[PDB]
RNA sequence: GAACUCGCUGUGAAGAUGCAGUGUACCCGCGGCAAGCUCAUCACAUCCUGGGGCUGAAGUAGGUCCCAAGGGUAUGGCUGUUCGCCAUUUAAAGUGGUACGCGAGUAUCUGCCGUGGGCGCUGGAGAACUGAGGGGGGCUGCUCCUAGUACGAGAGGACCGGAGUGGACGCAUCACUGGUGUUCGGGUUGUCAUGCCAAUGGCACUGCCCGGUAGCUAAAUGCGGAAGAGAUAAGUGCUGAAAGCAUCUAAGCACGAAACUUGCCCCGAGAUGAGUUCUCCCUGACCCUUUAAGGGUCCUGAAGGAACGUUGAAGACGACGACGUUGAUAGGCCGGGUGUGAGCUAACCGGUACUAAUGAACCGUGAGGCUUAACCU
RNA sequence: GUGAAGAGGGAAACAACCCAGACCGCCAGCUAAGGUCCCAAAGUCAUGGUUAAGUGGGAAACGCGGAAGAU
RNA sequence: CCCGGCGAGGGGAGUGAAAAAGAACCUGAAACCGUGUACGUACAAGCAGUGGGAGCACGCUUAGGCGUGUGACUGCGUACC
């Protein structure tokens, strides 16, 4: 405990935290850029990078797993077709995070997460 | 007489020579270069402080670089003191390995423990403090494997050292 | 009512933070422990571990006295019970003070532990240590050549304490025994959803179960209570008068308890008595005054440190360690292994700059004050 | 007699013990009780001894012992 | 006129004797909260004051040792009803 542990706790319900991660990943991939707090931003990057890495291999099983973890027909349809070839040369680090100060409402740090290519 | 400083590679139950799985510690033996030797006149006592490992120059600042240049050896993980046997004196620059340690079978081991956070009173006393991460003085250990080719020192039982933590082994006199 | 709100001893319309004596403590904070059945502390006026005298002490085993608090000094059946009665152990389940000690067991405050900010150690910074001083513990059953041997009339029956073998406890690690390991995999009931089957996902405690990566765990084992040394009380004494003897003492002049210290280790130079070793750096100018460890202005911003960026087997916050484009510090990818069941693989290991770790900025100096002594001038 | 309704000085503080009744001020001296190795001020004074026990510096009655006490 | 948010508020100019009279509007002390001034304090124990007191800045008799502000320290000192 408190030593050699991967993934910040973010005290919440397990199913609730999984659903929030799925929704946040879907929103970010749809919008190509999101504004999220750094503690959640790091978890977002850690949980989203595996999906884009797996998107490189196009197969029925891979598409089924992507839909299972995403539950959005449009997101799966656009995946395996555009992000894959765009970052074919790149191996890892498909996204970047830049800090944007803090939220005035509740002094909450915020950060922009966006694809490294970001366009084209 | 002379001690060594290294790290805990691992701790597993290895088969004995007879063929029985016995707990044994895996301790690497790194060549500890002699950096400075104390004298009873200049400083009041005689003892040798040595260094182990090799750290990049970025971490070491230039005053420490000059100190090591005085020592005549490259900067390493740090400096560890060792009491001299009050007899023969070593030379600055040379390094030593397990070598003669296979002649006592009573060598002592010193080191830290698991990284454990400040625990609650109930779980630690059943009054808030820390357990572990303290120097350990377990003694009366017996050496098992003294293979110097692998630069690994193995002793009977377990070793007081966390994964990747520094530790020392000395030719104890107690039992 | 106001506080610049320490401990012990003595007095006290009687447990004194405010009285007399005595000891300790750099100033200011954060998180806990609640003293004002759990938790303990102290004296011996001693239950044992015991060692020494006497013994109606042949040896074990004992009876009485002298020393010893270093350590321990139970579990059950009756009371609310202290106490007390019965069963089984052990070395014992010891006697007393603390209002049989302990019922604040918005704590404002004092008291104890972990951890920080300011400053001092006299030019600054970096580490490495001597180290006074405080703390952890001196636990224990059995066997073996010694040994049915010396001593002892026979019988009885050693100094031995050298070796191994269990137990209560702390320290240490998950590799063997497994548990946990809702972040890994598989089976599956009801309902909803993907145009529909198959196939997938949410809710029903992770819907309910079968295993389990890394880490943590005791039910697992590794070390252990030294030996030795100094000093010892009682006791035991080699030789020996005053007092033609004796005598532990008057002369010469020793051994000696498990009781004290050291011997092993933790913290520790805030030890203000502020310690020692080494290394790197600062080697400008000008002005004024009440005339000196004086002040002020321009330039300089060195060594070193820290706030940010990646972070950790360090962490409540602080704080410590590593990396920071002169790169494996974190994330991801490949490979290997485990798990699950040809696939997924979180946390296990090697490689990879593919991404994040920048350029920069801030604090920090301009030779270090005075007095005495030895060295070349 | 004290306090009640007298301060002050000595005894470690101590309301009950001892000296001693403050008009005020003054950087003078002399004394009461009590002390003159200091803290804390004064002789480490002088004469002849007891005490060798830290009794002094806490302990009766009883026959030098009695003596064990304030963590 | 300007800052400010096209507000509130404030600052210049002017009126106004006076704006240290501005619509919270005569004069505006204390309790309570700040800044600067001069001094002390980070090895020192208790009704926090009393006499002594070197130093630290200023004006003075232009020193001649005077006071103002303070007290490192010293002996003493156990709130009121």
Question: Would you list the DSSP string of B63-119?
Answer: HHHHHHHHHTS---S--EEEE--SS----TT-EE-SGGGTTTS--EEEE-------B
Residue B100: CB atoms within 10 A of its CB come to 12
Tokens matching residue B70: 């005085």
Crossing angle between the packed helical segments A38-54 and A14-31, to the nearest 10 degrees: 70
| Cα A102 → chain centroid | 21
Residue A18: CB atoms within 10 A of its CB come to 13
Distances (CA, A) of A78 to A24, A58, B113: 17, 12, 51
CA distance B90 to B38: 11
Method by which the coordinates were obtained? cryo-EM
Q: Which nucleotides of C are covered by protein (CB under 7 A)?
A: 31-33, 113-115, 124-131, 136, 170-176, 182-183, 194-195, 199-204, 206-207, 214-217, 221-227, 263-267, 276-280, 303-305, 309-316, 322-326, 330-334, 343-348, 352, 354-356
Q: Fill in the DSSP letter of residue B32.
A: E
The answer to whether position A72 is within a domain reads yes
CA distance B146 to B17: 13
The answer to whether position A7 is within a domain reads no
The answer to whether position A4 is within a domain reads no
Shortest Cα–Cα distance, B160 to chain A (Å) = 17
Tokens matching residue A21: 């991660």
* Residue A82, burial from CB neighbour count under 10 angstroms (0-12, 13-18, 19+): exposed
Report the relative pairing of strands B32-37 and B166-170 from DSSP bridges: unpaired
Report the relative pairing of strands B80-83 and B108-111 from DSSP bridges: unpaired
CB contact at 8 A, A111 and A101: no
SS (H, E, C) chain A: CCCCCCCCCCCCCHHHHHHHHHHHHHHHHHHCEEEECHHHHHHHHHHHHHHHHHCCCCCHHHHHHHHHHHCCHHHHHHCCCCHHHHCCCCCCCCEEEEEEEEECCCCEEEEEEEECCCCC
Structural domain of residue A76, as residue ranges? 13-115
Chain A residues with CB-CB distance to B115 below 8 A: 2-3
Report the relative pairing of strands B152-153 and A33-36 from DSSP bridges: unpaired
Backbone angles phi, psi at A3, to 5 degrees: -145, 130
Name, in order, each residue with C-beta under 8 angstroms of B28's C-beta and a sequence gap of 6 or more. B6, B7, B9, B151, B152, B153
Chain A residues with CB-CB distance to B117 below 8 A: 1-3
Name, in order, each residue with C-beta under 8 angstroms of B23's C-beta and a sequence gap of 6 or more. B11, B12, B13, B156, B157, B158
SS (H, E, C) A61-77: HHHHHHHHHHCCHHHHH
Instruction: Confirm or reject contact between B117 and chain A (CB < 8 A).
Output: yes
Name, in order, each residue with C-beta under 8 angstroms of B144's C-beta and a sequence gap of 6 or more. B14, B22, B24, B154, B155, B156
Element (H, E) at B26: strand B21-28
Backbone angles phi, psi at B145, to 5 degrees: -115, 130
Instruction: Confirm or reject contact between B116 and chain A (CB < 8 A).
Output: yes
Resolution for this PDB entry, in angstroms:
6.6
Output the distance from A92 CA to E55 C1' rounded to whole Å. 72
CA distance A57 to A20: 26
Nucleotide with smallest C1' distance to residue A87 CA: C354
Question: Which of A80, A3, A11 shows the shortest CA–CA distance to A43?
Answer: A11
Question: Which of B159, B120, B115, B152 shows the shortest CA–CA distance to B136?
Answer: B159
In chain B, the residue whose alpha carbon lies closest to the alpha carbon of A3 is B115
Shortest Cα–Cα distance, B126 to chain A (Å) = 19
CB contact at 8 A, B4 and B168: yes
Tokens matching residue B43: 């400083």
CB contact at 8 A, A58 and A85: no
Shortest Cα–Cα distance, B114 to chain A (Å) = 9
| b/e sequence A91-101, b meaning 16+ C-beta within 10 Å | eeebbebeeee
The answer to whether position A3 is within a domain reads no
CA distance B158 to B151: 18
Tokens matching residue B166: 């520094």
Chain A residues with CB-CB distance to B116 below 8 A: 2-3
Chain A residues with CB-CB distance to B114 below 8 A: 3
CA distance B174 to B130: 28
The answer to whether position A41 is within a domain reads yes
| Bridge partners of residue A34, in order along the sequence | A113
| Bridge partners of residue B96, in order along the sequence | B32
Angle at B111 between CA B110 and CA B113, to 5 degrees: 140
Q: Fill in the DSSP letter of residue B155.
A: B
| Bridge partners of residue B170, in order along the sequence | B108
Name, in order, each residue with C-beta under 8 angstroms of A38's C-beta and a sequence gap of 6 or more. A97, A99, A109, A110, A111
Angle at B62 between CA B57 and CA B66, to 5 degrees: 105
CA distance A100 to A34: 12
CA distance B156 to B63: 41
Domain boundaries, chain B: 1-175
CA distance B59 to A83: 40
| Bridge partners of residue B95, in order along the sequence | B33
How many distinct structural domains can be found in chain A?
1
In chain B, the residue whose alpha carbon lies closest to the alpha carbon of A2 is B117
- The CATH number of whichever domain residue A39 belongs to comes to 3.90.1030.10
Handedness of CA A5, A11, A12, A17 (dihedral sign): negative
Q: Count CB pairs under 8 A between chains A and B.
A: 8
Binding-site residues on chain A for chain B (CB distance < 8 A): 1-3
């Amino acid at each position: 405990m408190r030593h050699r542990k991967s993934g910040r706790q973010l005290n919440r319900n397990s199913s609730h935290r999984q659903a929030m991660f799925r929704n946040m990943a879907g929103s970010l991939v749809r919008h190509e850029i999101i504004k999220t707090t750094l503690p959640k931003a790091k978890e977002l990057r850690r949980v989203v990078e595996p999906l884009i890495t797996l998107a490189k291999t196009d197969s029925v099983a891979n598409r089924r797993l992507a839909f299972a973890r995403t539950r959005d027909n449009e997101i799966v349809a656009k995946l395996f077709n555009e992000l894959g070839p765009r970052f074919a040369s790149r191996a890892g680090g498909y996204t970047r995070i830049l800090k944007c100060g803090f939220r005035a409402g509740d002094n909450a740090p915020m950060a922009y997460i966006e694809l490294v290519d970001r366009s084209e | 007489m002379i001690g060594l400083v290294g790290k805990k590679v691992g701790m597993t139950r290895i088969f004995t020579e007879d063929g029985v799985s016995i707990p044994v510690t895996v301790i690497e033996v790194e060549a500890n270069r002699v950096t400075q030797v104390k004298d009873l006149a200049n400083d009041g006592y005689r003892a040798i402080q040595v260094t182990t490992g090799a750290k990049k120059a970025n971490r070491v600042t230039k005053p420490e670089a000059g100190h090591f240049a005085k020592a005549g050896v490259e900067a390493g993980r740090g400096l560890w003191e060792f009491r001299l046997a009050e007899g023969e004196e070593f030379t600055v620059g040379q390094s030593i390995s397990v070598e003669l340690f296979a002649d006592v079978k009573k060598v002592d081991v010193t080191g830290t423990s698991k990284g454990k956070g400040f625990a609650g009173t109930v779980k630690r006393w059943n009054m808030a403090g820390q357990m572990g991460n303290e120097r350990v003085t377990v003694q009366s250990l017996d050496v098992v494997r003294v293979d110097a080719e692998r630069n690994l020192l193995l002793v009977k039982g377990a070793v007081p050292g966390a994964t990747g933590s520094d530790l020392i082994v000395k030719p104890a006199v107690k039992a």
